[PDB]
From a paper:
The genome of ZIKV is organized into the form of a single positive strand RNA, encoding in total three structural proteins (C, prM/M and E) and seven non-structural (NS) proteins (NS1, NS2A, NS2B, NS3, NS4A, NS4B and [name]). Among these, [name] is the largest NS protein, containing an N-terminal methyltransferase (MTase) domain responsible for viral RNA capping and a C-terminal RNA-dependent RNA polymerase (RdRp) domain for viral RNA synthesis, with evidence indicating that the MTase and RdRp domains cooperate in RNA synthesis initiation and elongation. In addition, [name] proteins have been shown to inhibit the type I interferon (IFN) signalling to evade antiviral defence in the host8910111213141516. The essential role of [name] in viral replication and immunosuppression makes it an ideal target for antivirals.
To illuminate the structure and mechanism of [name] proteins, and, more importantly, to explore potential druggable sites for ZIKV, we determined the crystal structure of full-length ZIKV [name] in complex with S-adenosyl-L-homocysteine (SAH), by-product of cofactor S-adenosyl-L-methionine at 3.3 Å resolution. We were able to trace nearly the entire sequence of ZIKV [name], except for the first five N-terminal residues, residues 747–748 in the RdRp domain, and sixteen residues at the C terminus. The structure reveals an N-terminal classic S-adenosyl-L-methionine-dependent MTase domain situated on top of a C-terminal RdRp domain. Near to the catalytic site, the SAH molecule is surrounded by a set of conserved residues. As with other viral RdRps20, the ZIKV [name] RdRp adopts a capped right-hand structure with the Palm, Fingers and Thumb subdomains and a priming sequence poised to receive RNA substrates. The RdRp domain also harbours two zinc ions, as observed for the [name] proteins of JEV and DENV3.The associations of the MTase domain with the RdRp domain does not involve extensive interdomain contacts, leading to a modest buried surface area of ∼1,400 Å2. Remarkably, ZIKV [name] superimposes well with JEV [name], with an RMSD of 0.63 Å over 872 Cα atoms. In particular, the MTase–RdRp associations of ZIKV [name] and JEV [name] are both mediated by the same set of van de Waals contacts, involving the C-terminal extension of the MTase domain (P113, L115, Q117 and W121), and the Index, Ring and Middle fingers of the RdRp domain (Y350, R354, F466 and P584 in ZIKV [name]). By contrast, structural superposition of ZIKV [name] and DENV3 [name] gives a RMSD of 6.06 Å over 844 Cα atoms, attributed in large part to the difference in the relative orientation between the MTase and RdRp domains. Detailed analysis of this inhibitor-binding site revealed that the critical residues for the inhibitor binding are also conserved in ZIKV [name], arranged in a similar structural environment; therefore, suggesting that the same compound may also be inhibitory to the enzymatic activity of ZIKV [name].
Numbering used by the authors: 6 to 746, 749 to 887
The structure:
C-alpha cells in the first residue's frame, strides 16, 4: 500500500463529522453565490460562469500549465464551464464540447458569455463510443468518485484508454482529469503515458480534500511519483491537527457579447447594395455603429444600430389535449416537443452553425453539366407553357389574411395589415417608384427581413430548441417578385403534368399514389436522401442556371426578372437581430450573394427545379454517362445532350420532387454511390459520412417523403386508398403545444388537430379514438383556429365546422382521382386501420394496459373536459 491508499483507507474509516469537517479543510474556494442566484433567476448575460469548473481551468491557464489555442475539445462537457472559459482566450478560435447528459447528468447550459458564438455544445454524446478527431487543444474532465479504490482505478484506466486515441493525433495543449493517480498500477500507467505523451500532473488547490484528483497538463515537467506522493503528503497532513479555514477568491467574470471571427467576406458588389445600405444607415443614423466583434464569417458586415427585441421562447401546453392524452404524459418522445426559441439569441445560435456557411464553387466540368441540364430542363418546362407577367389584381386576390407587411423604411411603414395596404394607392405608388428604379438599373428598397420560425420540435439540452431562420422582403418588393417570376407558381410550371417529376399542388393524400406508381417501374431501390440545409447550398451557379428562364421571355419581362434576380436574388441585403453586451439587442445589416431565402416568392418552384436537375445529374453519374474526370473538365458534352434527349423524361417520371425533398427510383443500385457530382455541387446528403454509399428501400411504403411514409389500405368493400403515416409521437407532441395564445382559443386549436387526425391519420387507432374524444369534449358549434401543419402539402380541409365524414368522402372518394368507384362510405366503421404490426411500429400503444384503461374511462374523462371547457354549451358524442 502506497501513501495514496493510506489516504483513501483512512478516508473510508471516517464518520459524518470527520468527513464533513475534513472536506473543505484548508482548500480554496470561489464565491459562487451570486452566480447560482442569477443562473437560477435566469440572466444569460453578466458574465457568470455556469459551474465551479471554470475556476479550476483558469487557475491552471494563468499559471502556464496550459496554453489553449485554436480548436478546443471539451470531453465530458457537463454544463460546459470549461468550454465557456476557453472561448475567452485570444488565441482560441473554435470550441466544441461533448457530454452524456440525459438522466442524472448535468446538461449543457446556454449563456451569453464573451465568445459564445465559437462554442458548440452537444449533449447525448457517450465519448467512450466516439471516434477521435484532430484538435489543437484537448480537455477532459471525466472521473466519477467511488468509495472503493479498485473502482476508481479501473474507471480511470478506462478514461486513459479512451483519451489515448485522441492523443495520438498530437494535440498542442491538453488537460485531462486523472481521478485516481495514487495506486501502484496507476503510477506505472501514468509513467509510461508520461513517456509517450509528456506533460505532468498538477494538484489544483480548488479541489476538495475528499478526492485525490490531479490534472494531466501539457506545460508541466514534474515527476509522476513525486507529484502524486507529494499531494498525498498534503492531504494526509491535512487529516491531522485542527481544521484550517478556507481561502475565498472572487469568481471569474467572463464578460458578455460575441467574438470577432476570421472572415471569408466575399466582396459584396457595393455598386448594387450601396444605396440600400446608405438608406438603412441614414434611417438609423443616431445609433449606427460598426460592431468590431460581429460573429459573421461567410457574410459581409456593414453596420449595426440599437433596436428592441422580438420573438419569444415560451411554450404553453394545451390542457385539453394533455388531459385527453394521459398515457403519453410519460412518453419522452411526445413530452419533449415544444416551441423553438425565436429570440435574437435563439435564432442566432442556429444561424452561426447552419446558415453562416460558404460552399466552395464546384469544378468547371460540373458547372458545364449543370448549365446543360438546366437549359434542357427549362426548355422542356416551357414546351407548352409561356412566361407571363402577373398583375396587381392577381396579387390582390392572392394576399390573404395572414400575409406580413415587412416594412423596412419609413415610407413602407404606413399600414397595419397587408390587405389594408394593397387597397391603398400610395402603396402601389411605392411599387411604381421602385420599379422605375429597377428599370433604371438600381434598387432602393428590396431589403430582406430575417428572423426565427416558431416551430414545434423536440428540445435540446432539456430546453426549447433554437429557431430555423426565415427571411422575406416587404410587400412591394414581394410584388415585384410576383410580377416577374410569379408565373412559375401561378401557371403550375412545376406541376406533375408539366415538370414530370414534380408534385406541386398535390396534397398529403395523393403523394402515396405517386410513390406506388414509381414502384411499378423496373429498377433499383428507392432513394430519398434529404439534403442538409438546402437553402444554404444554392450556389451562385445554381442562381445563374435558374435565371435561364429570362431567355424564354419577352424583352421587358426579361429585364424585369433580371432586375429582381440580379438586384435581389443574386445580391441579398439582410437585417437581423443579435444580442449585444449588457443584455441589450441590436440590428445587424449584412449582405451575401449565394443563397436562397426562405420567403422568396418562387422558392418552392426554383428549389424543385434545381433538385430535379441534381437528381438527373446523379442518374447520369450512376449510369456511367459521366466519369471521375468530368468534374475538372467535361469531355464531349454531346454525351450529355444525347442522354437527356434520349432518356431524360423517362428519368423525370422516375422521380417525385417537392423542393428540397425528393424520391428517386433509378435504373439500378449504382445510384447509391453516385456521389462525386452530388458532393461537388454542394448538395451534401444528411445523416451520413460524405462518401458512404446511399441506403434505399425495397418497400415503397417505408420510403420517407415530405416527412411521411405511405401505406395502401383496403376498405371493407374491396376498394383501396393510399394514406399518409408518420410516427405518432410527433403528432401528439405537436398537438400538446400552443404558440402563446383563453380556454376557448385553446379548445378550438385542439378541435383543429382532432379533425386533421380524423382526415389524414384516421388509420391510427389511438389518434382516431383521441379525435372522437377531443371532438366529443369540445363544443360542437366552436370553429377551429390555429395552424396544425407547416407542410405545403397540408391544405386545411379540416379547418371547417362541417361534418367530417363528408370531407372524408369528398377527398378520399368524391375528389379522389385514383378512386374510380364513387360509392361513398356511409359509416366510420367501414374505414379500415393499419395493420396491427404496422400500427405498432409507427408508435401505436395498443395492447398496453395503460392505454386500454385510458380507452375504457375515455368517456368519463370526456365529461371531465366538458366540465373544464364550460358546462352550458352544447356537446355531441362522436365516440359512438
Ligand atoms: N461516459 C461519459 N461520456 C460523456 N460524458 C460523461 C460520461 N460520464 C460522465 N460524463 C459527464 O462528464 C461531466 C464532467 S463534470 C465536468 C464539467 C465541466 N468541467 C464544468 O466546468 O462544469 C459530468 O457532468 C458527467 O455527467
Ligand atoms: Zn428594388
Ligand atoms: Zn406507418
Amino acid at each position: 500500500e502506497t501513501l495514496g491508499e493510506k489516504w483513501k483507507a483512512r478516508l473510508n474509516q471516517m464518520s459524518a463529522l470527520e468527513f464533513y469537517s475534513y472536506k473543505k479543510s484548508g482548500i480554496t474556494e470561489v464565491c459562487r453565490e451570486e452566480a447560482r442566484r442569477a443562473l437560477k433567476d435566469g440572466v444569460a448575460t453578466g458574465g457568470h460562469a455556469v459551474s465551479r469548473g471554470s475556476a479550476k481551468l483558469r487557475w491552471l491557464v494563468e499559471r502556464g500549465y496550459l496554453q489553449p489555442y485554436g480548436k478546443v475539445v471539451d470531453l465530458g462537457c457537463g454544463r460546459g464551464g470549461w468550454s465557456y472559459y476557453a472561448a475567452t482566450i485570444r488565441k482560441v478560435q473554435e470550441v466544441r464540447g461533448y457530454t452524456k447528459g440525459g438522466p442524472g447528468h448535468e446538461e449543457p447550459m446556454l449563456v451569453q458569455s464573451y465568445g459564445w458564438n465559437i462554442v458548440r455544445l452537444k449533449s447525448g454524446v457517450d465519448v467512450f463510443h466516439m471516434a477521435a478527431e484532430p484538435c489543437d487543444t484537448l480537455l477532459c474532465d471525466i472521473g466519477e468518485s467511488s468509495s472503493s479504490p479498485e473502482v476508481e482505478e479501473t474507471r480511470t484506466l478506462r478514461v486513459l484508454s479512451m483519451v489515448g486515441d485522441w492523443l495520438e493525433k498530437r494535440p498542442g495543449a491538453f488537460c485531462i482529469k486523472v481521478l485516481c493517480p495514487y495506486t501502484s498500477t496507476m503510477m506505472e500507467t501514468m509513467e509510461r503515458l508520461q513517456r509517450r505523451h509528456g506533460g505532468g500532473l498538477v494538484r489544483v488547490p480548488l479541489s476538495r480534500n475528499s478526492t485525490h484528483e490531479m490534472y494531466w497538463v501539457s506545460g508541466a515537467k514534474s515527476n509522476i511519483i513525486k507529484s502524486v506522493s507529494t499531494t498525498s503528503q498534503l492531504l494526509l497532513g491535512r487529516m491531522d491537527g485542527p481544521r484550517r479555514p478556507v481561502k475565498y477568491e472572487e469568481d471569474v467574470n467572463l464578460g458578455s457579447g460575441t467574438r470577432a471571427v476570421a472572415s471569408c467576406a466575399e466582396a459584396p458588389n457595393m455598386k448594387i447594395i450601396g444605396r440600400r445600405i446608405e438608406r438603412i444607415r441614414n434611417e438609423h443614423a443616431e445609433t449606427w455603429f460598426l460592431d468590431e466583434n460581429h460573429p459573421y464569417r461567410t457574410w459581409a458586415y456593414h453596420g449595426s444600430y440599437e433596436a428592441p427585441t422580438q420573438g419569444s421562447a415560451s411554450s404553453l401546453v394545451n390542457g385539453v389535449v394533455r388531459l385527453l392524452s394521459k398515457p403519453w404524459d410519460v412518453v419522452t418522445g411526445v413530452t419533449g416537443i415544444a416551441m423553438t426559441d425565436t429570440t435574437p439569441y435563439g435564432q442566432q445560435r442556429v444561424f452561426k452553425e447552419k446558415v453562416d456557411t460558404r460552399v466552395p464553387d464546384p469544378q468547371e466540368g460540373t458547372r458545364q453539366v449543370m448549365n446543360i441540364v438546366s437549359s434542357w430542363l427549362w426548355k422542356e418546362l416551357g414546351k407548352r407553357k409561356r412566361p407571363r407577367v402577373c398583375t396587381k389584381e392577381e396579387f390582390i386576390n392572392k394576399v390573404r389574411s395572414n400575409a406580413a407587411l415587412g416594412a423596412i423604411f419609413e415610407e413602407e411603414k404606413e399600414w397595419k395589415t397587408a390587405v389594408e395596404a394593397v387597397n391603398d394607392p400610395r402603396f402601389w405608388a411605392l411599387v411604381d417608384r421602385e420599379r422605375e428604379h429597377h428599370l433604371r438599373g438600381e434598387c432602393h428598397s428590396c431589403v430582406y427581413n430575417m428572423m426565427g420560425k416558431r416551430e414545434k420540435k423536440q428540445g435540446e439540452f432539456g430546453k426549447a430548441k433554437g429557431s430555423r431562420a426565415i427571411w422575406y422582403m416587404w410587400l412591394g418588393a414581394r410584388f415585384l417578385e410576383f410580377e416577374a417570376l410569379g408565373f412559375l407558381n401561378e401557371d403550375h410550371w412545376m406541376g406533375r403534368e408539366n415538370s414530370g417529376g414534380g408534385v406541386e399542388g398535390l396534397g398529403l393524400q395523393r403523394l402515396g399514389y405517386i410513390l406506388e406508381e414509381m414502384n411499378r417501374a423496373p429498377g433499383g431501390k428507392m432513394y430519398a436522401d434529404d439534403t442538409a440545409g438546402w437553402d444554404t447550398r444554392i450556389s451562385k451557379f445554381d442562381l445563374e442556371n435558374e435565371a435561364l428562364i429570362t431567355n424564354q421571355m419577352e424583352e421587358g419581362h426579361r429585364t424585369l426578372a433580371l432586375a429582381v434576380i440580379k438586384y435581389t436574388y443574386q445580391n441579398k441585403v439582410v437585417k437581423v437581430l443579435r444580442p449585444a453586451e449588457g443584455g441589450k439587442t441590436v440590428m445587424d445589416i449584412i449582405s451575401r450573394q449565394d443563397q436562397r431565402g426562405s420567403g422568396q416568392v418562387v422558392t418552392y418552384a426554383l428549389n424543385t427545379f434545381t433538385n430535379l436537375v441534381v437528381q438527373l445529374i446523379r442518374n447520369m453519374e450512376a449510369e456511367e454517362v459521366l466519369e471521375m474526370q468530368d468534374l475538372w473538365l467535361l469531355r464531349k458534352p454531346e454525351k450529355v445532350t444525347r442522354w437527356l434527349q434520349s432518356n431524360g423524361w423517362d428519368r423525370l417520371k422516375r422521380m417525385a420532387v417537392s423542393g428540397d425533398d425528393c424520391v428517386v427510383k433509378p435504373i439500378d443500385d449504382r445510384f447509391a454511390h453516385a456521389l462525386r457530382f452530388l458532393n461537388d455541387m454542394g448538395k451534401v446528403r444528411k445523416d451520413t459520412q460524405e462518401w458512404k454509399p446511399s441506403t434505399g428501400w425495397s418497400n415503397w411504403e417505408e420510403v420517407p417523403f415530405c416527412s411521411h411514409h405511405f401505406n395502401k389500405l383496403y376498405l371493407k368493400d374491396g376498394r383501396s386508398i393510399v394514406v399518409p403515416c408518420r410516427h405518432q409521437d410527433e403528432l401528439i407532441g405537436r398537438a400538446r403545444v400552443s404558440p402563446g395564445a383563453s380556454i376557448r382559443e385553446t379548445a378550438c386549436l385542439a378541435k383543429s388537430y382532432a379533425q386533421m387526425w380524423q382526415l389524414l391519420y384516421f388509420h391510427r387507432r389511438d389518434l382516431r379514438l383521441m379525435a372522437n374524444a377531443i371532438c366529443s369534449a369540445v363544443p360542437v358549434d366552436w370553429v377551429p383556429t390555429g395552424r396544425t401543419t407547416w407542410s405545403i402539402h397540408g391544405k386545411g380541409e379540416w379547418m371547417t365546422t362541417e361534418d367530417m365524414l363528408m370531407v372524408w368522402n369528398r377527398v378520399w372518394i368524391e375528389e379522389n382521382d385514383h378512386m374510380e368507384d364513387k360509392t361513398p362510405v356511409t359509416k366510420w366503421t367501414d374505414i379500415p386501420y393499419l395493420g396491427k404490426r404496422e400500427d405498432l411500429w409507427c408508435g401505436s400503444l395498443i395492447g398496453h394496459r395503460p392505454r386500454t384503461t385510458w380507452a375504457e374511462n375515455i368517456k368519463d374523462t370526456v365529461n371531465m373536459v366538458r366540465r373544464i371547457i364550460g358546462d352550458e354549451e352544447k356537446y355531441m358524442d362522436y365516440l359512438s
